[PDB]
Design a protein around this ligand. Structure first.
Ligand SMILES: CN1CCN(CCCNC(=O)c2c(-c3ccccc3)c(-c3ccc(Cl)cc3)cn2CC[C@H](O)CO)CC1
Length: 142
């Protein structure tokens, strides 16, 4: 029952990041805007780490899930917090841009699904217990 809303948040963020990197293909608005702003701030703060990610990934359709699962499990190893959720969205965004750059566009819809499933199954309980997305908007939005 949460599947569609979590999918909408993931697709809004990924569409935004792909557009920001030059690819125009293929309140809920307050949450989407706060996440876009948080993702931008995160990328500007950790630009070096994105460069290290884009140079060590060697993304292929066969390894993309293994890479996704490895990084996401490491990110949340010590538990969840809002900063790690922002890193999770940012990582997904970076993986999608890298997939399109390497002519592996087929991975974009796959990564969106892996992100929505992880948000649904592992992050949603923490999100609700820590004030919901309205709390996130207060801490990261405007
Ligand atoms: C020696 N270590 C000292 C401390 N650091 C590791 C622990 C903190 N970093 C992470 O957990 C982390 C982040 C991340 C998380 C938040 C901020 C910055 C980086 C990302 C990440 C990469 C790309 C994008 Cl786009 C987004 C996130 C991946 N990881 C885990 C994979 C990494 O190889 C470590 O195991 C650096 C090396």
């Amino acid at each position: 029952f949460m599947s569609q809303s979590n999918r909408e948040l993931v697709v809004d963020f990924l569409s935004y990041k792909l557009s920001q990197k030059g690819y125009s293909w293929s309140e809920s608005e307050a949450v989407k805007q706060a996440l876009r702003e948080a993702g931008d701030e995160f990328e500007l703060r950790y630009r070096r780490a994105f460069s290290d990610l884009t140079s060590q990934l060697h993304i292929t359709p066969g390894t993309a899930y293994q890479s996704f699962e490895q990084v996401v499990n490491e990110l949340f190893r010590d538990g969840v917090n809002w900063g790690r959720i922002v890193a999770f969205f940012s990582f997904g965004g970076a993986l999608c841009v890298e997939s399109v750059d390497k002519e592996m566009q087929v991975l974009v819809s796959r990564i969106a699904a892996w992100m929505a499933t992880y948000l649904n199954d592992h992050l949603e309980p923490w999100i609700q217990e820590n004030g919901g997305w309205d709390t996130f908007v207060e801490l990261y939005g405007n």
